[PDB]
Amino acid sequence: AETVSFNFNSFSEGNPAINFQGDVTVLSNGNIQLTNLNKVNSVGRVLYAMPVRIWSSATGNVASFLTSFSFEMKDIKDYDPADGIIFFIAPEDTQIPAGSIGGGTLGVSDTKGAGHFVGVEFDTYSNSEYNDPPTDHVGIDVNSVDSVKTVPWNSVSGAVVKVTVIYDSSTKTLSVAVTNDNGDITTIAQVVDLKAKLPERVKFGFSASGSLGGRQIHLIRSWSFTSTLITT
């Protein structure tokens, strides 16, 4: 019964529990703003400092986790949304890809759109090079920004979005429940074998990118997480 669990309803620079990468910044109201509105191909990632052990090579066991968070995207003259946020899980040594071009890489993949991570994205800009659907979408990414599975969605400027992700180790099923501003929910689920795609010790976090013409305000308002791993 090994269990990790933290909870932030706000943030503050200096908190050792959080690692900052890229153009990340903390607003005077505890909000985390992932990108820089004057930088080209701006990328900003935020990770939970302490690495979590999602699976043990000693017991074959994979941990389960229930996490939920709330983000918000808002438009800015005169750019076009850029192109979103992504909740990812990667190896502990994870760093913004070298020479990151932002954009469709969302700050976690290389140019080909590949990388070593598993995540859920809230994509707001269609990128033909990665097979993005023609509309805002939610997709489960496994080592590539070319989502293994997507679903129509719609990002509403200035609207707060509540997401609840559940990963059940028994079936190896990652489920996502998105509750939009107006009240409707958008779900999407996919079987993903963490023990076969990631190393025992990984880290959790959010990443947001941008481009030259495509730029917007990405904000992470709160985050609660709990990962329980059976040890027997």
For residue 130, say whether it is annotated as part of any ligand binding site.
Answer: no
Q: Which is nearer to Mn ion, 72 or 132 (CB)?
A: 132
Q: Which is nearer to Mn ion, 86 or 198 (CB)?
A: 86
Pairing state of beta strands 201-208 and 44-48?
antiparallel
CB 147, min distance to Mn ion, A: 5
Q: Is 40 in the site for a second copy (CB under 8 A)?
A: no
Q: Strand, helix or coil at 141?
A: strand
Round to whole Å and give the CA distance between 91 and 224.
20
Q: Which is nearer to Ca ion, 125 or 167 (CB)?
A: 125
Round to whole Å and give the CA distance between 54 and 1.
13
Q: Which is nearer to Mn ion, 4 or 85 (CB)?
A: 85
Nearest CA to 80 out of 211, 209, 219 is that of: 211
Q: Which residues pair with 122 in a beta bridge?
A: 85, 138
For Ca ion, what does the binding mask look like between residues 107 and 146, x meaning CB under 5 A?
Answer: ----------------x-x-x----x--------------
For residue 146, say whether it is annotated as part of any ligand binding site.
Answer: no
120-179 positions binding a second copy, by CB under 8 A: 149, 151, 157-158, 160, 164, 166-171, 173, 175-177, 179
* Contact yes or no for 66/174 (Cβ under 8 A): no
Q: Strand, helix or coil at 208?
A: strand
66-105 positions binding Ca ion, by CB under 5 A: 83, 104
Single-letter code of the amino acid located at 57:
S
CB 173, min distance to a second copy, A: 5
* Contact yes or no for 186/138 (Cβ under 8 A): yes
Give the residues lining the site for Mn ion (CB under 5 A): 123, 132, 139, 147
Q: Which residue ranges make up the annotated binding site for Ca(2+)?
A: 123, 125, 127, 132
